Amino acid sequence: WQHGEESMAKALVACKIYRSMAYEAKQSDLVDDTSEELKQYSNDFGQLAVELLEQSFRQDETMAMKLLTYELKNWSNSTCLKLAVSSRLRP
Amino acid sequence: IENGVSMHKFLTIPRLEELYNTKQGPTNPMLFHLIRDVKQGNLPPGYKITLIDIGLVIEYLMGGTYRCTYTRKRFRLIYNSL
Amino acid sequence: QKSWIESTLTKRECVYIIPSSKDPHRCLPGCQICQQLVRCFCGRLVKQHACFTASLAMKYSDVKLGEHFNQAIEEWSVEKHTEQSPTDAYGVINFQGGSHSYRAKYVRLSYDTKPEIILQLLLKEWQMELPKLVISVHGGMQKFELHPRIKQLLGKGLIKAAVTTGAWILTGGVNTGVAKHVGDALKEHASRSSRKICTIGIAPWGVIENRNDLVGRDVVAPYQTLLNPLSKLNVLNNLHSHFILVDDGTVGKYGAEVRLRRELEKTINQQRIHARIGQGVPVVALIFEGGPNVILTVLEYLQESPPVPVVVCEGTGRAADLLAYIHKQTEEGGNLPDAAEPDIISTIKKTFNFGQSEAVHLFQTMMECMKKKELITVFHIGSEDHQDIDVAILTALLKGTNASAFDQLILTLAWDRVDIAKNHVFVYGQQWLVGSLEQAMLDALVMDRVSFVKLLIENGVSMHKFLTIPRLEELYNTKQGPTNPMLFHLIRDVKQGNLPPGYKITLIDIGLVIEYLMGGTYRCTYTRKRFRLIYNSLETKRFPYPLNELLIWACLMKRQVMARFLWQHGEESMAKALVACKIYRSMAYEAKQSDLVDDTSEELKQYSNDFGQLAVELLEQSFRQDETMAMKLLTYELKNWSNSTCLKLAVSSRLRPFVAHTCTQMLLSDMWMGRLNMRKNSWYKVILSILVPPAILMLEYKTKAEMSHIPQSQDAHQMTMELPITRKFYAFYHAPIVKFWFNTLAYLGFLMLYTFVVLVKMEQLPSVQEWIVIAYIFTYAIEKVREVFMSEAGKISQKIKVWFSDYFNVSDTIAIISFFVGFGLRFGAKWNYINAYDNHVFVAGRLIYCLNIIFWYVRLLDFLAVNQQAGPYVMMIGKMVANMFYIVVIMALVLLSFGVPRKAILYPHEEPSWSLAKDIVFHPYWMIFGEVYAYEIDVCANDSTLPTICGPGTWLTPFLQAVYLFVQYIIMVNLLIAFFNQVYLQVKAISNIVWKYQRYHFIMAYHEKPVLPPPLIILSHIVSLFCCVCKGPKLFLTEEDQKKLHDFEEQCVEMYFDEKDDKFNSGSEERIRVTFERVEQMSIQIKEVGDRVNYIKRSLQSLDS
Amino acid sequence: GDALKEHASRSSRKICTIGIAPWGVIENRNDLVGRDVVAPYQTLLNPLSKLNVLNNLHSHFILVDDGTVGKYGAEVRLRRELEKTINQQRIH
Ligand SMILES: CCCCCCCC/C=C/CCCCCCCC(=O)O[C@@H](COC(=O)CCCCCCCCCCCCCCC)COP(=O)([O-])OCC[N+](C)(C)C
Ligand SMILES: CCCCCCCC/C=C/CCCCCCCC(=O)O[C@@H](COC(=O)CCCCCCCCCCCCCCC)COP(=O)([O-])OCC[N+](C)(C)C
Ligand SMILES: CCCCCCCC/C=C/CCCCCCCC(=O)O[C@@H](COC(=O)CCCCCCCCCCCCCCC)COP(=O)([O-])OCC[N+](C)(C)C
Ligand SMILES: CCCCCCCC/C=C/CCCCCCCC(=O)O[C@@H](COC(=O)CCCCCCCCCCCCCCC)COP(=O)([O-])OCC[N+](C)(C)C
Ligand SMILES: CCCCCCCC/C=C/CCCCCCCC(=O)O[C@@H](COC(=O)CCCCCCCCCCCCCCC)COP(=O)([O-])OCC[N+](C)(C)C
Ligand SMILES: CCCCCCCC/C=C\CCCCCCCC(=O)O[C@@H](COC(=O)CCCCCCCCCCCCCCC)COP(=O)([O-])OCC[N+](C)(C)C
Ligand SMILES: CCCCCCCC/C=C\CCCCCCCC(=O)O[C@@H](COC(=O)CCCCCCCCCCCCCCC)COP(=O)([O-])OCC[N+](C)(C)C
Ligand SMILES: CCCCCCCC/C=C\CCCCCCCC(=O)O[C@@H](COC(=O)CCCCCCCCCCCCCCC)COP(=O)([O-])OCC[N+](C)(C)C
Ligand SMILES: CCCCCCCC/C=C\CCCCCCCC(=O)O[C@@H](COC(=O)CCCCCCCCCCCCCCC)COP(=O)([O-])OCC[N+](C)(C)C
Ligand SMILES: N#Cc1ccc(COC[C@H]2O[C@@H](n3c(NCc4ccc(Cl)c(Cl)c4)nc4c(N)ncnc43)[C@H](O)[C@@H]2O)cc1
Ligand SMILES: C[C@@H]1CC[C@@]2(OC1)O[C@H]1C[C@H]3[C@@H]4CC=C5C[C@@H](OCCC(CO)CO)CC[C@]5(C)[C@H]4CC[C@]3(C)[C@H]1[C@@H]2C
Ligand SMILES: CC(C)CCC[C@@H](C)[C@H]1CC[C@H]2[C@@H]3CC=C4C[C@@H](O)CC[C@]4(C)[C@H]3CC[C@]12C
């Protein structure tokens, strides 16, 4: 994650994937859920985005609002904010 | 990657494709479950995971309308060509 | 063309052909394998030279048929056999595979290009600022090898000198040379990713690896990290930012460093270091192990004009060692000690593997190198010889290059670094020019370099001497610093719209701003008739107290770090900090209102509450020494700040924590007393002594000694200048506590009569009581008018804006205006003479009385809040009524959610009526208070008070009401409880502070109130009126006491700093920091001994044997 | 003074240094003329300055005027007597 680019975007995709695997694990069980293992893995990425944002909001609040809205084009023409709302990432 | 190994150079279809098809690591045994779901029950003997498949999982995990690059008409072509 | 790069720059390349070494190797017929292999002297394979005109000659073999004077070719003229064209290789490297992918950028030009073009695109196209240093590292370029300390430490400097001066390190580019080595430092340090060093590293396009990857116009490059073991072509080094790839027009060849790396150096040294300063940008040449060519290159910079110095290093390799070696042998430069003049040539041999004719040639270069040992230095990492190559680099430009200490200093000023000048310019026995110190302070102030202000004011630069009208006047008229762009806004406002073209700010103007920012009546020195004269005339042109004038400048132009520095110096420290808190607090309000871009208001509001907190923290440091003098500090007329007071400024800035300190409250008590010593006396005695005048003569007053810290009016000072019986009354009646308990007992005799009138019937004419009632209000109203006109504020529109920002002065206005609607309709009426309450006019005027009364019982909270326990609880009922408006609206939806269905379900025949506006709101409100109307639920029941309301649907209301009260008595009314219980400390803490602050405006209103209460006050009005047509406090000190107080402030400031410095140095967190940093250093200085001791042992094991 | 500043005595009623000297070898004598008068005495580190500044950190001074510029001697006539005269007084 730290390598490459589009760091905020990637972290919020991960928070969705882990959050989405956890829900499927609970539902479709076979042995130990590993769900709280995943829910911890989501809320780790999903907390980097929050902590990456504040580090950008404190520099230039204007551009840090453009980050939440530019079409990503490597992530299905979605948006760094429409992914958070998809993951119910309230913070 | 420090001493110099560009991921851009070391990331083909065949390389990437088998990185899913390995048990030689801390594998998630759940990935094979999500796949056999999106196939609607189908489950061949060995089942080489194809990148069509990983796409349809992400389209299913990310929900809504998230289309991965792995499912678009372009990528479907080239995957059936190599 | 759309690209200034190729629109301006061009690429050179071979266009003719010149076979390089015609003779084919093997493969018996030459013709094909000859041409296929035999490169042009152009460069690359002869066949590769496409450039069509050449390619219609490559067709057979070349240009100039075969032999055809094979000797004639053999030059490849780089203008005729070589034409240039617009660039097609200029883009941005990405360094494919780089661990966070450090970036750079490239162009590709022709070496005949002039440096004007390279400079302008560098600072326009590539968009940089001119540096403040150019570290051109003309060292040895052979991927060489070092020891960790010098691999590690040497970078600790080199990086640091370049980040602290925004340098442009100018290497050779290639990753097999001096470039390779700085990168080892650039990464070991990482510069905490930023706009760090903006390294250039110019190299050619000829010896470069993967040239074809980064071809194309303004194109990203997949440039790859090829550490292929052989790779005759070389990679650019990683960490280097911006590149230039000057294409000579030939692969393989060299030379595209010096044609520009010469010109660039001189051309940057031709430009001005800064707007204010007028020197040339410095060039410094660093050497990592050099070479036969470098050791001459070293010499060239020694021989240039300007004499660009050099820095070499003991222990990087051959050249840097030898130049450092002969620096030991050669003394004075001119010597060469002749005992070893080829003995170095013995060393010149072994290090390089040179010969003989070049051995003296190297030795020759060594001589002219030494002929000026002045402007060249050495880095002896093995010893304590000017550590941390920084100092050496930064210093070396000053020692060698002949320049006055001014010309030295002003450079150090540009480089925001005192530590150099503190130890290398401000050194012993120096020739300091008379006005250079002054002229430097002009530059350090405008450029916001506090550290040099400190330096100069230490070494001796009196602000009293360096502060004229013209100097000060332009310090506002500068853009060369962190300017506030708002100052020009406040000026164009106070000019009432006027805005000339350039508008030299005059000191008239700054005055009118401060008069506008500080408000009230604050007259600055800049506007008084005296100063207006002298300004229109130009040591009398100086200011007495400069640091009172710069502290304004540092704050108007938003230069906080300057402001605090200029605050600790000078005198009147408490006063200055509270002016600043007002100015910043006043600019913030004007920023919000008059916006243009980012408010900067929270930036200012933080700047105010910083000063405004020093005053509070400076006070407590003075209250804990001598509580008496610390109350005199709050009251002495300042005389440099418009005859104002250290407390009247806090009140102006609404700085609650100061007025609510325990010194601003013990003074206010001491004025509340007056000439009374109410710690001995008791409130019983005052109430008695009012209704018993001759009991005043048994009250124990205070001596003129015990009223030194208490500001007085002129008259009370006189009664203590000129206790007798007659002065023993005057001191009672003119006491604030007495004026209070002499109004309360009147007001509490007003509310006992008014209450009597309101309750008892009211005949045609007012009874004796009601006349006395009107008398109070009328005479009270007059007291409220004169309270306005004789208020502190200036323009009436501002007097009519502070007196209406008060809950009880509005409530008086509503209650004095209303009672005279009441007295108007009560006295002015026809009075039916049969029964009152048959004239609705009369009725009306009463119900005005019986309701106005609520304004007058509620006012006893103005009296009851005098107490230190009751005040807060009165100042909470505002902050609980305010912060629950939103629960209480939620409690009114539920009320109508229930009241509308019930009145619809129960009374289903109602024509439109106003009763449908009460009965949907009436009973559902009295339910909140526990009235369930239990015999009206289930109206069809047998126990009902409403047996006629029984009808279809009326079985639903018991359910609706069940749901209702569960919300209005269990959910919502217990949400209030939980609201108050959790907002109690944080409103009780405040409401104390809002109370202790409002105690000021209350006491200081009785201290200007008439003695005589609002029934008899009319006498004291007529006295003042009659005589003012015919005929505030001050802390009167003697000139001796002004000094003793002045001494008190001085010491108390000095302690505030001396204590906090120790509270920081004594803290654990700080001792861990030092301990840590020592123990790091200790590890080093031990292990080196541990090494050395291990050499003194292996020695003595073998010396004697 | 180099010591008095390196330590700073954590500003207080610290050492009350006297440092008696004359009015003859003194620099900017004219700045501090007048009865009970504040002095704009200035920090002149002019490189030559045959006349010399009083050192900074020194508190109370005495400037015994022999009645002659340039001359010396207005140390010992009092710096003798003072020493003995304080040594004549009771310590407590
Ligand atoms: C510090 C600032 C805040 C305080 C503000 C202070 C100013 C206060 C502001 C006041 C403004 C409020 C309005 C004025 C009051 C009267 C209005 C009214 O209705 O009058 C009535 C009486 O009119 C008469 O002329 C007969 C009674 C004498 C008038 C006494 C009221 C004026 C006193 C003012 C002393 C104020 C000065 C106090 C000393 C400074 C008119 O109606 P009517 O005639 O009854 O109707 C007859 C109808 N019928 C025939 C059918 C029956
Ligand atoms: C017989 C009886 C008949 C009457 C019975 C009915 C009585 C009805 C009961 C009425 C309630 C009366 C008490 C409320 C007082 C206001 C509270 C207050 O001061 O708030 C704020 C004033 O804020 C301001 O900006 C100042 C100007 C506002 C004036 C408000 C007028 C209300 C008039 C209502 C007309 C009602 C008239 C109804 C009758 C015609 C507090 O201060 P601030 O916000 O800091 O001030 C700005 C200062 N600053 C800019 C420096 C920050
Ligand atoms: C259906 C019934 C519904 C309820 C009816 C209404 C009842 C409720 C009352 C309504 C009166 C209207 C005024 C509301 C107050 C507004 C201001 C405020 O909230 O606080 C502000 C001041 O507050 C004050 O100065 C007064 C606070 C209100 C006291 C209420 C009277 C209590 C006694 C009545 C006895 C009557 C008994 C007899 C009755 C016949 C302070 O707010 P803040 O957060 O500090 O803001 C900063 C202020 N600043 C700008 C100055 C810096
Ligand atoms: C800023 C903050 C806002 C404050 C709150 C909002 C303001 C308050 C708003 C209130 C609504 C308005 C009510 C009055 C409407 C007119 C009534 C009328 O003309 O006649 C009525 C008479 O009875 C009365 O006039 C009594 C007074 C009204 C009751 C007030 C209830 C207050 C408690 C609740 C307050 C909580 C409010 C909850 C929120 C909704 C009835 O009709 P009638 O036929 O004439 O009477 C029978 C006579 N007969 C038998 C002889 C025939
Ligand atoms: C919980 C433990 C306690 C026991 C539980 C036992 C449960 C068994 C309940 C059974 C209810 C059915 C039997 C009653 C009908 C008989 C006819 C009758 O009397 O009609 C009456 C209507 O009265 C009603 O309709 C009564 C209310 C019915 C709904 C009950 C609540 C739903 C269950 C709970 C869920 C609630 C949701 C909660 C939401 C948060 C009409 O007669 P009247 O009143 O005389 O008016 C007519 C007069 N007139 C003709 C002159 C105009
Ligand atoms: C504006 C401020 C002024 C300053 C105030 C002082 C100046 C005011 C001074 C005097 C005013 C009165 C003088 C005029 C004549 C009075 C006649 C009268 O009412 O007699 C009644 C007493 O009095 C009352 O019942 C009303 C007055 C006294 C009680 C209320 C005010 C007391 C507070 C103020 C003083 C203490 C303060 C305490 C708190 C600190 C008695 O008669 P009655 O009740 O009708 O019954 C008799 C029996 N019979 C009917 C069967 C025959
Ligand atoms: C009247 C104008 C109304 C316009 C608004 C003015 C607002 C108030 C202005 C000014 C301030 C108050 C003074 C004027 C009002 C009170 C006096 C008064 O009017 O007495 C009336 C006489 O009534 C009596 O003789 C018996 C009761 C009152 C006398 C005691 C006065 C109390 C105030 C003293 C202590 C406070 C002062 C202390 C300073 C030393 C005369 O008025 P009238 O209407 O002719 O009376 C009816 C007819 N009658 C005479 C046959 C009985
Ligand atoms: C400066 C501000 C001024 C305020 C406004 C001034 C208002 C001045 C207004 C009027 C002055 C003149 C009075 C007469 C009016 C015409 C009606 C009339 O004559 O008689 C009618 C009275 O009908 C009513 O309604 C009387 C009461 C209305 C006044 C309400 C004022 C509210 C003030 C709010 C508080 C403000 C607080 C301000 C706070 C900041 C009927 O009576 P009649 O015919 O005479 O005889 C008996 C009838 N009968 C036979 C049927 C039994
Ligand atoms: C005429 C014959 C004589 C008798 C008449 C007079 C009787 C007495 C009058 C009033 C009753 C209360 C008296 C207590 C005063 C004690 C002294 C005191 O400390 O006062 C304090 C409050 O000062 C005040 O004035 C508080 C408000 C009282 C006057 C307004 C009426 C409110 C009470 C009625 C409301 C309606 C309730 C209805 C209930 C039925 C001030 O001082 P402190 O807080 O101690 O200051 C602390 C710091 N220090 C001490 C270092 C300075
Ligand atoms: N000593 C002393 C002293 C004497 C009297 C007072 C009473 O307060 C007077 C002023 O106190 C002001 N004030 C008040 N007054 C409180 C209040 C006033 C009236 C009522 Cl009925 C109630 Cl329920 C409460 N609250 C304030 C606040 N939250 N912020 C700023 N100012 C406030 C108000 O303008 C009022 O005019 C306060 C202190
Ligand atoms: C958001 C909130 C939604 C609910 C609500 O507030 C806002 O919406 C308001 C609309 C109001 C009605 C509008 C008009 C009239 C006509 C009038 O006709 C007099 C006729 C005759 C008398 O005899 C003249 O002589 C009688 C009163 C009535 C019905 C109002 C009652 C209160 C109502 C229902 C209010 C209610 C509290
Ligand atoms: C709607 C009209 C016609 C009828 C009367 C309305 C009621 C609600 C009015 C009449 C008198 C008013 C009071 C008069 C004075 C005050 C003192 C003030 O400090 C707080 C509000 C308070 C306590 C008012 C609250 C509202 C009030 C009680």
DSSP string, C821-878: HHHHHHHSS---SS-SSS-HHHHHHHHHHHHHHHHHHTTHHHHHTTSTTHHHHHHHHH
- Give the span between the Cα atoms of C1013 and C1006, in whole angstroms: 11
Neighbouring chains to C with at least 3 Cβ pairs closer than 8 Å? A, B, D
Other beta carbons within 10 angstroms of residue C860's beta carbon come to 14
Name all contacts of B14-20 with Cβ < 8 Å and 24+ positions apart.
Answer: B14/B82, B16/B51, B17/B48, B17/B49, B17/B50, B17/B51, B20/B49, B20/B54
- Give the span between the Cα atoms of C169 and C288, in whole angstroms: 14
Token duo for residue C115: 């440096």
DSSP-derived secondary structure for C323-356: HHHHHHH-STTT---GGGTTHHHHHHHHHHT--S
Ligand 5 pocket check: which of C944, C946, C955 to mutate, most ligand atoms within 8 Å of Cβ? C955
Residues of A in contact with C99 (CB under 8 A): 3
Residue C990 burial by Cβ neighbours in a 10 Å radius (0-12, 13-18, 19+)? middle
SS3 at position C312: strand
Pick the residue from chain B with its C-alpha nearest to C228.
B4
Start-to-end CA span in chain D (Å) = 29
| Sign of the C-alpha dihedral computed for residues C860, C862, C868 and C872 taken in this order | positive
Atom index in ligand 6 nearest the CA of residue C747 equals: 2
Say how many CB pairs under 8 Å bridge C and D.
23
SS3 at position C10: strand
- Give the span between the Cα atoms of C41 and C70, in whole angstroms: 12
Whose tokens are 């007028």? That residue is: C278
Could you say which of C96, C99, C222 has the minimum Cβ distance to residue B2? Answer: C99
- The residues near C879 (Cβ < 8 Å, ≥ 6 apart) are C987, C990, C991
Name the residue among C241, C264, C152 with its Cα closest to residue C195: C241
- The answer to whether C583 touches C556, Cβ cutoff 8 Å, is yes
- Give the span between the Cα atoms of C648 and C655, in whole angstroms: 10
- The residues near D19 (Cβ < 8 Å, ≥ 6 apart) are D54, D55, D58, D61
Q: Tell me the CB-side half-sphere exposure of residue C786, using CA atoms within 13 A.
A: 18
How far from the centroid of its chain's Cα atoms is residue C761's Cα? Answer: 69
Name the residue among C293, C370, C382 with its Cα closest to residue C337: C370
State which H helix or E strand residue C793 sits in.
none
Region label for D28, one of left (φ > 0), alpha (ψ between -120 and 50) or beta (otherwise): left
Strands (E), C49-174: 82-86, 89-93, 134-136
Name all contacts of C884-891 with Cβ < 8 Å and 24+ positions apart.
Answer: C884/C976, C884/C979, C887/C972, C887/C975, C887/C976, C887/C979, C890/C972, C891/C928, C891/C968, C891/C972, C891/C973
Bridging pattern class, strands C283-286 and C310-313: parallel
Name the residue among C446, C445, C584, C467 with its Cα closest to residue C514: C584
Q: Give the burial string for C271-284 (b: 16+ CB within 10 Å, else e).
A: eebbebbeeebbbb
Other beta carbons within 10 angstroms of residue C315's beta carbon come to 17
- The answer to whether C1084 touches C1090, Cβ cutoff 8 Å, is no
Whose tokens are 């170095």? That residue is: C344
Resolution of the experimental model in angstroms, please? Answer: 3.0
**Torsion, CA C1063, CA C1064, CA C1068, CA C1069, rounded to 10:** 150
SS3 at position C86: strand
> Which alpha helices (DSSP H) does C569-600 contain, by range?
573-593
- Give the span between the Cα atoms of C145 and C168, in whole angstroms: 24
Token duo for residue C1071: 């001792």
Residues belonging to chain A: 91
- The residues near C173 (Cβ < 8 Å, ≥ 6 apart) are C179, C201, C202, C203, C236, C237, C240, C243, C244, C245, C257
Name the residue among C319, C317, C299 with its Cα closest to residue C309: C299
Residue A64 burial by Cβ neighbours in a 10 Å radius (0-12, 13-18, 19+)? middle
Residue type for C724, please? P
Ligand minimally distant from the alpha carbon of residue C849: 2
Token duo for residue C341: 């003049």
- The residues near C470 (Cβ < 8 Å, ≥ 6 apart) are C538
Q: Tell me the CB-side half-sphere exposure of residue C860, using CA atoms within 13 A.
A: 14
Residues of A in contact with B28 (CB under 8 A): 21, 34
Give residue C807 CA to ligand 3 midpoint distance, Å. Answer: 9
Q: Give φ, ψ of C956 to 5 degrees.
A: -90, -25
- Give the span between the Cα atoms of C643 and C524, in whole angstroms: 10
- Give the span between the Cα atoms of C177 and C185, in whole angstroms: 13
Name all contacts of C824-832 with Cβ < 8 Å and 24+ positions apart.
Answer: C826/C762, C826/C766, C827/C765, C827/C766, C831/C764
Residue type for C148, please? P
Helix %, strand %, coil % of chain D (to 5):
20, 5, 75
Token duo for residue B70: 């792995």
Whose tokens are 């406090």? That residue is: C1033
Rg (CA), chain D: 15
- The answer to whether B41 touches B13, Cβ cutoff 8 Å, is no
- Give the span between the Cα atoms of B31 and C1074, in whole angstroms: 53
- Angle (CA) C951 C955 C956, round 5°: 120
Name the residue among C774, C852, C786, C763 with its Cα closest to residue C815: C852
| Interface contact C430-D40, CB threshold 8 A | no
Helix %, strand %, coil % of chain A (to 5):
60, 0, 40
Q: Shortest Cα distance from B80 to chain A (angstroms)?
A: 22
- The answer to whether C438 touches C516, Cβ cutoff 8 Å, is no
Residue C258 burial by Cβ neighbours in a 10 Å radius (0-12, 13-18, 19+)? middle
Q: Shortest Cα distance from D13 to chain C (angstroms)?
A: 9
Rg (CA), chain A: 14
SS3 at position C90: strand
CA nearest ligand 1 atom 32, residue:
C820
Name the residue among C677, C682, C651 with its Cα closest to residue C731: C677
Q: Give φ, ψ of C937 to 5 degrees.
A: -70, 140
Other beta carbons within 10 angstroms of residue C197's beta carbon come to 26
Residue type for C127, please? Q
SS3 at position C696: helix
Residue type for C15, please? V
Region label for B53, one of left (φ > 0), alpha (ψ between -120 and 50) or beta (otherwise): alpha
- Give the span between the Cα atoms of C985 and C983, in whole angstroms: 6
DSSP-derived secondary structure for C373-403: -TTEEEE-TTTTSS-STHHHHHHHHHHTS--
Instruction: Give the method used.
Output: cryo-EM
Q: Give the burial string for C813-843 (b: 16+ CB within 10 Å, else e).
A: bebbebbbebbebbeebeeeeeebeebeebe
Ligand 4 pocket check: which of C884, C918, C925, C926 to mutate, most ligand atoms within 8 Å of Cβ? C918
Pick the residue from chain D with its C-alpha nearest to C426.
D45
Name the residue among A79, A80, A76, A74 with its Cα closest to residue A46: A80
Strands (E), C142-209: 203-204
How far from the centroid of its chain's Cα atoms is residue C1050's Cα? Answer: 28
Atom index in ligand 10 nearest the CA of residue C805 equals: 34
- The residues near C506 (Cβ < 8 Å, ≥ 6 apart) are C473, C535
Chain C residues within 8 A (CB-CB) of chain A? 99-101
Peptide bond just before C306 cis, omega within 30 deg: yes
- Give the span between the Cα atoms of C656 and C992, in whole angstroms: 10
How far from the centroid of its chain's Cα atoms is residue C961's Cα? Answer: 59
SS3 at position D26: strand
Other beta carbons within 10 angstroms of residue C176's beta carbon come to 17
- The residues near A9 (Cβ < 8 Å, ≥ 6 apart) are A72, A74, A75, A80, A83
CA nearest ligand 8 atom 47, residue:
C839
- Give the span between the Cα atoms of C272 and C275, in whole angstroms: 7
- Give the span between the Cα atoms of C738 and C730, in whole angstroms: 11
C310-313: strand order across its sheet? C134-136, C283-286, C310-313, C376-379
Ligand minimally distant from the alpha carbon of residue C993: 10
Chain A residues within 8 A (CB-CB) of chain B? 3, 13, 16-17, 20-21, 24-25, 28, 30, 34, 74-76, 78, 86
- The residues near C184 (Cβ < 8 Å, ≥ 6 apart) are C151, C155
**Torsion, CA C303, CA C308, CA C313, CA C319, rounded to 10:** -30
CA distances from C830 to B29, C760, C833, C837, D67 (A): 100, 20, 8, 11, 103
- Give the span between the Cα atoms of C236 and C180, in whole angstroms: 8
- The answer to whether C577 touches C615, Cβ cutoff 8 Å, is yes
**Torsion, CA B58, CA B61, CA B66, CA B68, rounded to 10:** 0
- Give the span between the Cα atoms of C57 and B28, in whole angstroms: 66
Residue type for C1015, please? P
- Give the span between the Cα atoms of C134 and C308, in whole angstroms: 11
Name all contacts of C695-700 with Cβ < 8 Å and 24+ positions apart.
Answer: C696/C728, C696/C729, C696/C732, C697/C725, C697/C728, C699/C732
User: Do B and D count as touching (3 or more CB pairs closer than 8 A)?
Assistant: no
CA distances from D3 to C424, C543, C881, D42, D57 (A): 22, 34, 64, 22, 9
- Give the span between the Cα atoms of C10 and C4, in whole angstroms: 11
SS3 at position C221: strand
Residues belonging to chain B: 82
